[PDB]
């Protein structure tokens, strides 16, 4: 169906320990496909998914230079933010950027992104119109004035509508075997007595792709959002994801509980119960 491409940049200062490290990682949906690390012995844009390996030498050489120049821009930006926030040169600080585009099943642009954070807090973000900015504070307003004067949004828009959509379309085709395959969750319900009058019912979902999933418990067909322990979806390391949802139930009331599973890979949502 719908797809996304994202690049995640992280630059971290380390006063007294050399220059800030730059990392850029690229994803199509929940699949990482490229990495660059300025701390690597010989920094280079490297493949991280089999379907990107076919890209020619011009791809790797161009991306490596872009990431090497970007490494320097983020070092300049960390210096700039020490001035805008009246901070000392003693502490470690972080700049992060998320950029990318989403497309629909036809490959048409749904929306683009270009947003940044400083110390894990929003800094400046390109609005959905790809023409205006949202600055989080008076320091980000200085960057906003600088970016309005230099018509930066126009340049970001051009990448997001063109290059970003075009390459996502190419990657989806080259990786169609995996990027365009949904693996449904493999599900089961476990039961563990906690004491003589309470037991835990845990609903499992394993081996699914993409990561997006809904796992819920119902008691007498009513959602138990407040009484459910829901772990964050976690990677298995083989491309797939895992998740579980648990409820503490009164002994003898297990059959009043149902686990409901929604996933792209499922033609219809599943209903599970504890099967003694």
């Amino acid at each position: 169906g719908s797809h996304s491409m994202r690049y995640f940049h992280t630059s971290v200062s380390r006063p007294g320990r050399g220059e800030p490290r730059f990392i850029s990682v690229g994803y199509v949906d929940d699949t990482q496909f490229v990495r660059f690390d300025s701390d690597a012995a010989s920094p280079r844009t490297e493949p991280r998914a089999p379907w990107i390996e076919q890209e020619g030498p011009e791809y790797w050489d161009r991306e490596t230079q872009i990431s090497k120049t970007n490494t320097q821009t983020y070092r300049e930006d960390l210096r700039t933010l020490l001035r805008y926030y009246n901070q000392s040169e003693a502490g470690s600080h972080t700049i992060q950027r998320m950029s990318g585009c989403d497309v629909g099943p036809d490959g048409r642009l749904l929306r683009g992104y270009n947003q940044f954070a400083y110390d894990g807090k929003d800094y400046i973000a390109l609005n959905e119109d790809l023409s205006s900015w949202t600055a989080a504070d008076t320091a980000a307003q200085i960057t906003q004035r600088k970016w309005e004067a230099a018509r930066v949004a126009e340049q970001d828009r051009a990448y997001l509508e063109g290059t970003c959509v075009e390459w996502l379309r190419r990657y989806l085709e080259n990786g169609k075997e995996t990027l365009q395959r949904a693996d449904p969750p493999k599900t089961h319900v476990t039961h563990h007595p906690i004491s003589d009058h309470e037991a835990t019912l845990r609903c499992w979902a394993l081996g699914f792709y993409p990561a997006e999933i809904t796992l819920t418990w119902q008691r007498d067909g009513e959602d138990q959002t407040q009484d459910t322990e829901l772990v964050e979806t976690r990677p298995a390391g083989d491309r797939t994801f895992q998740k579980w949802a648990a409820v503490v139930v009164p002994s003898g009331e297990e059959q009043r509980y149902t686990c409901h599973v929604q996933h792209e890979g499922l033609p219809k949502p599943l209903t599970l119960r504890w099967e003694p």
Binding site: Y7, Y59, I66, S67, T73, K146, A150, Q155
Partner: peptide, 9 residues
């Protein structure tokens, strides 16, 4: 494919 940063802060 990612490009150069358009402008610094």
């Amino acid at each position: 494919f990612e490009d150069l940063r358009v402008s610094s802060f």
